[PDB]
Amino acid sequence: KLSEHLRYCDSILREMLSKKHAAYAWPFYKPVDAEALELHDYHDIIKHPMDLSTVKRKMDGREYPDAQGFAADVRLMFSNCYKYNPPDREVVAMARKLQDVFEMRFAKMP
Numbered sequence: 001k002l003s004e005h006l007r008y009c010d011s012i013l014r015e016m017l018s019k020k021h022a023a024y025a026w027p028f029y030k031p032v033d034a035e036a037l038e039l040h041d042y043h044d045i046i047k048h049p050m051d052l053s054t055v056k057r058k059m060d061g062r063e064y065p066d067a068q069g070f071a072a073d074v075r076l077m078f079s080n081c082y083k084y085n086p087p088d089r090e091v092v093a094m095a096r097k098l099q100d101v102f103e104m105r106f107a108k109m110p
Contacts, residue, residue, distance in 0.1 A: 004110075012102065013059060021098060024094040028051055030052075032080075050073050055077070074106075078102075
């Protein structure tokens with residue numbers, strides 16, 4: 001039942017990484033590079049960074065004991081974005097659109 005839930009989570013991750021959602025998902029593909037973005041205080045503000053490539057590494061490494069752990073990391077990723085950025089930034093609107101996908105797919109887990 002646990003393995004079945006995590007297979008469903010793995011499929012949600014594939015969807016989040018897929019062409020269909022790329023127009024808004026792309027900022028979330030790799031870890032935030034604070035130096036490259038010249039957001040030098042990022043790690044002062046955000047204490048637990050997360051991104052989709054890290055979720056993928058953790059999934060592949062069997063690091064999630066259950067679906068709840070997966071969902072906590074994905075929500076962490078979105079919460080970091082909302083916390084760091086002013087609410088009118090384009091990247092916040094992109095996070096929201098991707099989170100709409102995530103929350104719906106996660107809720108529909110059999």
